[PDB]
Structure 1
Amino acid sequence: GPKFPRVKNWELGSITYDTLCAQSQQDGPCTPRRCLGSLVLPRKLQTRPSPGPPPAEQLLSQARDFINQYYSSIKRSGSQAHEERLQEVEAEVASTGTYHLRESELVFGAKQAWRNAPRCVGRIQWGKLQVFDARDCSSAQEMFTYICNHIKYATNRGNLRSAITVFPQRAPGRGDFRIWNSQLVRYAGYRQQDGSVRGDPANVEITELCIQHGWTPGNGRFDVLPLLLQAPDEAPELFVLPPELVLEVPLEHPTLEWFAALGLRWYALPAVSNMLLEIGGLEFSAAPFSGWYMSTEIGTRNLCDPHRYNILEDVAVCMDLDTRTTSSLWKDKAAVEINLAVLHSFQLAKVTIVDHHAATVSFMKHLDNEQKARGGCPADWAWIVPPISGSLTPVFHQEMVNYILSPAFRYQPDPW
């Protein structure tokens, strides 16, 4: 009947229609001929910068759309203040080629970008975001101050709080503010003479950049990287995070006493720093944000990916499993105990964390909330379903519709 995607839950038998996808103004990577939904970074997901501001016609339409979004969210659509704000944006773009967001618009926009993020299972929390306005920042040194404050506020001694800090937007003929690091906290990856890697192989490139830029390298598996911070039209400067600001959790297992002897650990705060926050056509190239971890990010991906710390076989050996045959399920067994250790250790340390069952259950609640609020919720099934125990969580059995809404967090090319 309804001219919209029909969405089914196969556990419960229930049916919804997504009308929200009608609001999408940007194409994704799929066509009637082939689905490219499993691609991490298709050409249709990456952006590209250009030294001059967008066609004013293009900016204006994106801006008017956002201003409309804003005035709706405060139930003043069609009002005199709504129309005057539009005029003010048209005028500002007409004379300068760009415009600026009021503070409450920036707050609404940051929350909406999170709410719109199809790959995030944590969106039940979308309305609880502390927005630090840093659009006054004028130096790399000052970015560091703002970032340290963010870290202190967000970490809160283990009672984590979601936050984003927004640095000045891209400007016509002026260099970007950029944080070179992909996260505020990253372990070094040192390429050994044998070709193997000590530390986190995900971080080889950023490690060597830090070294090129004068950082004296350690040689551990868990060396915290310094930040490479870039103010407009300047070489990036190097900043060492004071160790007491970086909360870490040593990993131990509730019953396997040898696990603590492994010397594994992870940091408390997942703070992503290389993403572009786009609002009403405005581009915030530096806008780091943080929440708290879902345990599978640490226990399954970062610790067990073959191209990350790759500890599965080591743990399986300690567990005395048969690692000579796939059918012993030694990988599945070790992976479970590693995830358990992550959960147990974070709880012991009083550091906020959520397991993949609690997380996906809460994401189902989010889906129902959004069905009523907006008539749908953009969601990337492959990313929402956790990397272990897929069909054991409710999201596996939930069909999802994926599409791009703005405000958005977007990937952007590396500054170098």
Structure 2
Amino acid sequence: RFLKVKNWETDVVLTDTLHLKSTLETGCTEHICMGSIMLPSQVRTKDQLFPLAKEFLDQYYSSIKRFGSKAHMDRLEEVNKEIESTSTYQLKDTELIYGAKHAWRNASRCVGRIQWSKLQVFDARDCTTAHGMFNYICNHVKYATNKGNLRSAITIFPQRTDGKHDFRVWNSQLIRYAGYKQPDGSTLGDPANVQFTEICIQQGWKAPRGRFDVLPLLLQANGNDPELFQIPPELVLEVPIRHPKFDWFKDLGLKWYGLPAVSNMLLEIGGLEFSACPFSGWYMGTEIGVRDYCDNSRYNILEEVAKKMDLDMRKTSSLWKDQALVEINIAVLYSFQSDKVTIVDHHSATESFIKHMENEYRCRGGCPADWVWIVPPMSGSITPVFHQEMLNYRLTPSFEYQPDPWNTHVW
């Protein structure tokens, strides 16, 4: 019940007591493990809301060494009063900042959590319109990008009330490339964004129909129809992709954007639901070079790179895919580093996470971690996280998935 995790490369053994504080469910049972399911299933009556608020305030006042004190009891009483009256409540600025940093700290699928405490939280709870949302998002983008010296940030729009007045960013990321289905049946640009690229066109947008067209923002305030906004191109930092050895690499015409900024998740703090809460950090190189570039359901460039490398593509056992894969990921890192845009390779990031785990076990009693997501999509076993046992459990505050708004919106 006081569980232990072993690193099989170093024999370091850590003891986990934090899991006992787990609140939500994993979708596993003792008869079946669902550890590789992408998304298991896992409005609030007045009954459900106050315990959730109590739990959150308890951990907040503990964190500032004021558990069971003056201010703690008062704030519990005050929030207790507000829920009885308004059937909801509002976080003080300090509690909102704490809740957001801890949602990141608790994200068991995130390898970059050693940075969790440096998050810049932009309070946008006074926003009322999509034009105002656009303004907050431009400021976020500019602040986070910082001319290539990327800084972590989250912007938090007003919380859900009755489900009718939801704030939503319809984009999955603030910055993503368009995808178009060609007449000849193929796909131009990013195939993952074909449907969204249509809900932009088939709703107003005017597509350049290129291979790397920055999508517009589709912003929904207070439950109204969403509105199209173009991010000022001067705010969208992009990196042309070249190789430090293959001069033909530059001729491939590849680029990527510097800022990874997830915008479709739900931030839950003390029972309150923030349905629009775009957050951003900086890339790990494999996210672009392995997944974005080489997935068969994405830009899928492996064949073309290997052909330009003149590798033997007759038999899989020549490992031509693996050879091209390494080079593509050398070029991504080389290009970001050359343009002075923050990026981390998978070796450095997983080493940081092991140190972060050791820190969290030593100072917090544990660190929930999802091995299936933490281990990078290339060279898995030469990174230290491959040999690290991890316990996965759900702590709150948390980031959660939510349905795509176009399947839900009372249009």
Q: TM-score, normalised by structure 1?
A: 0.97
Greater than 6 Å deviation, 4+ residue runs: none
Offset from partner CA, 1:159-214 (integer Å, 9 cap, x none): 00000000000013641000000000010000112221100001011100001211
Structure 2 CA distance for aligned equivalents of residues 354 and 207 of structure 1? 29
Structure 1 CA distance for aligned equivalents of residues 202 and 74 of structure 2? 51
SS of the residue corresponding to residue 228 of structure 1 reads: strand
Aligned partner letter, 2:296: P
SS of the residue corresponding to residue 248 of structure 2 reads: helix
Q: 1:129 aligns with which of 107, 115, 119?
A: 119
Q: 1:306 maps to which residue? A: 296
Q: 1:163 aligns with which of 142, 153, 167?
A: 153
Q: How does 1:363-382 map to 2 (within 5 A)?
A: 363-382=353-372
Q: 1:88 maps to which residue? A: 78
Aligned partner letter, 1:307: S
Q: 1:15 maps to which residue? A: 13
Structure 1 CA distance for aligned equivalents of residues 111 and 117 of structure 2? 14
Q: 1:36 aligns with which of 34, 49, 54?
A: 34
Offset from partner CA, 1:32-61 (integer Å, 9 cap, x none): 0110000111122xxxxxxxx412121111
Of residues 220-229 and 192-201 in structure 1, the stretch that sits farther from structure 2 once superposed is 192-201
Given the alignment of the two structures, is residue 222 of structure 1 paired with residue 212 of structure 2, yes or no? Answer: yes
SS of the residue corresponding to residue 126 of structure 1 reads: helix
Offset from partner CA, 1:391-415 (integer Å, 9 cap, x none): 0000000000001000000000011
Structure 2 CA distance for aligned equivalents of residues 281 and 395 of structure 1? 33
- Cα gap change, 1:342 to 1:107, in 2 (>3 Å): same
Structure 2 CA distance for aligned equivalents of residues 216 and 390 of structure 1? 42
Q: 1:359 maps to which residue? A: 349
Q: 2:110 aligns with which of 115, 120, 126?
A: 120
Q: How does 1:318-397 map to 2 (within 5 A)?
A: 318-397=308-387
Given the alignment of the two structures, is residue 297 of structure 1 paired with residue 287 of structure 2, yes or no? Answer: yes
Q: 1:269 maps to which residue? A: 259
Structure 2 CA distance for aligned equivalents of residues 242 and 308 of structure 1? 26
Q: 1:204 maps to which residue? A: 194
Structure 1 CA distance for aligned equivalents of residues 257 and 123 of structure 2? 25
Give the superposition deviation at 1:372: 1.1
Structure 2 CA distance for aligned equivalents of residues 297 and 173 of structure 1? 33
How many equivalent pairs are there?
Answer: 406
Q: 1:403 maps to which residue? A: 393
Structure 2 CA distance for aligned equivalents of residues 197 and 73 of structure 1? 51
Give the superposition deviation at 1:69: 1.1
Q: 2:229 maps to which residue? A: 239
SS of the residue corresponding to residue 343 of structure 2 reads: coil
Structure 1 CA distance for aligned equivalents of residues 184 and 401 of structure 2? 33
Structure 2 CA distance for aligned equivalents of residues 61 and 323 of structure 1? 60
Given the alignment of the two structures, is residue 279 of structure 1 paired with residue 269 of structure 2, yes or no? Answer: yes
Structure 2 CA distance for aligned equivalents of residues 117 and 321 of structure 1? 40
Q: 2:25 maps to which residue? A: 27
Consecutive unaligned residues in structure 1, runs of 5 or more? 45-52
Structure 1 CA distance for aligned equivalents of residues 294 and 317 of structure 2? 18
SS of the residue corresponding to residue 229 of structure 1 reads: strand
Structure 2 CA distance for aligned equivalents of residues 218 and 24 of structure 1? 48
Consecutive unaligned residues in structure 2, runs of 5 or more? 407-411
Aligned partner letter, 1:299: G
Aligned partner letter, 1:32: E
Aligned partner letter, 2:179: G
Q: 1:188 aligns with which of 169, 178, 194?
A: 178
- Cα gap change, 1:21 to 1:173, in 2 (>3 Å): closer
SS of the residue corresponding to residue 405 of structure 2 reads: coil
What is the identity percentage for the equivalent residue pairs of Structure 1 and Structure 2?
A: 68
Structure 1 CA distance for aligned equivalents of residues 193 and 73 of structure 2? 48
Aligned partner letter, 2:104: W
Structure 1 CA distance for aligned equivalents of residues 268 and 235 of structure 2? 29
Give the superposition deviation at 1:374: 1.2
- Cα gap change, 1:195 to 1:70, in 2 (>3 Å): same
Q: TM-score, normalised by structure 2?
A: 0.98
Offset from partner CA, 1:341-390 (integer Å, 9 cap, x none): 00000000000000000000000010001001211100000100000000
